Amino acid sequence: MENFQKVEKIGEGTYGVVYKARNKLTGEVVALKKIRTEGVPSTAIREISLLKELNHPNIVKLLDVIHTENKLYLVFEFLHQDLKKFMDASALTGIPLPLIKSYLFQLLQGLAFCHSHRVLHRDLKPQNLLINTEGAIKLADFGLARAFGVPVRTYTHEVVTLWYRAPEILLGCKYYSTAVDIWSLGCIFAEMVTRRALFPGDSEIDQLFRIFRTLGTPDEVVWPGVTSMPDYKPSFPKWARQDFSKVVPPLDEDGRSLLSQMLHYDPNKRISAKAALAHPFFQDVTKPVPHLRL
Numbered sequence: 001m002e003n004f005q006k007v008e009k010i011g012e013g014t015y016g017v018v019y020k021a022r023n024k025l026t027g028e029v030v031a032l033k034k035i036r037t038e039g040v041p042s043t044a045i046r047e048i049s050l051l052k053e054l055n056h057p058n059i060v061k062l063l064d065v066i067h068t069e070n071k072l073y074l075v076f077e078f079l080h081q082d083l084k085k086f087m088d089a090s091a092l093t094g095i096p097l098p099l100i101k102s103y104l105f106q107l108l109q110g111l112a113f114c115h116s117h118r119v120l121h122r123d124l125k126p127q128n129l130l131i132n133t134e135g136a137i138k139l140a141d142f143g144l145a146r147a148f149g150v151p152v153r154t155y156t157h158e159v160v161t162l163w164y165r166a167p168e169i170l171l172g173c174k175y176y177s178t179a180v181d182i183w184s185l186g187c188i189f190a191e192m193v194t195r196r197a198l199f200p201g202d203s204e205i206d207q208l209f210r211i212f213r214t215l216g217t218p219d220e221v222v223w224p225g226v227t228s229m230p231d232y233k234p235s236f237p238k239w240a241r242q243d244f245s246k247v248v249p250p251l252d253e254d255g256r257s258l259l260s261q262m263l264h265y266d267p268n269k270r271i272s273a274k275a276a277l278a279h280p281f282f283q284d285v286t287k288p289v290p291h292l293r294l
């Protein structure tokens with residue numbers, strides 16, 4: 001727009017490209033998501049306008065939605081750093097446990113909110129988690145049931161990511177449950193602790209097999225109905241579940257317990273965001289402030 005001076009290309013955020021921008025009338029600094037024709041989908045505009053009504057301190061605010069120039073512009077609250085950059089910045093030192101715990105707690109509060117309004121994130125990954133200097137972390141760039149795709153990229157371009165995808169999705173499930181977000185958040189939790197991605201797949205089958213190698217090949221005893229899922233194959237290799245103490249060391253037993261419940265195969269056994277908030281891991285949760293180099 002003329003209304004907005006692009007300051008800096010922030011990223012390429014899962015539907016298009018995101019810029020840091022200043023409103024030349026009001027002066028406010030925002031995130032501007034650009035989505036590039038043929039009168040695009042009224043049904044997206046309603047699940048999008050729905051995203052606008054999400055109101056919670058741990059969810060990045062969608063300020064406005066502007067449809068123009070054969071484009072869709074989403075105007076979002078701006079934060080100065082994402083979790084991926086923060087994790088890279090502290091990869092030698094580690095993120096201190098109280099801060100990891102604070103971040104996990106806030107994100108569970110955010111998901112508990114979304115999920116109680118029947119909204120799923122669908123695309124949770126470090127790059128979609130934004131932090132500020134006050135110790136806050138916020139869910140950003142929510143994905144849509146369809147929107148513009150579901151493409152195999154934000155667009156065009158570059159690096160689509162399977163790393164945080166729940167196994168029921170990889171196994172061809174049609175209807176997502178809130179559980180898929182808990183799985184992604186579990187993967188992110190592991191990654192904050194170990195400073196390495198938990199399941200860094202290079203393809204959809206490699207992603208699935210990396211999960212099987214770690215958590216064991218699922219069967220009817222641990223996940224009733226799995227062998228009838230659309231993409232399940234009897235020919236999957238049978239990997240034994242490897243011991244969980246090897247997964248996220250040196251995380252304490254409270255942390256390992258909670259992670260284990262967030263990574264249950266069966267989406268019905270997987271812990272809910274609200275039940276997670278009650279886990280003994282959060283007995284001593286506080287709100288540290290990060291040291292941010294902006």
Ligand SMILES: NS(=O)(=O)c1ccc(/N=N/c2ccc(O)[nH]c2=O)cc1
Pocket residue numbers: 010011013018030031060076077078079080081082083085086130140141
């Ligand atoms: N320099 S950095 O990589 O850590 C980084 C990354 C993203 C960023 N802002 N991104 C946003 C994305 C979506 C949104 O609704 N708001 C944002 O601020 C601001 C900074």
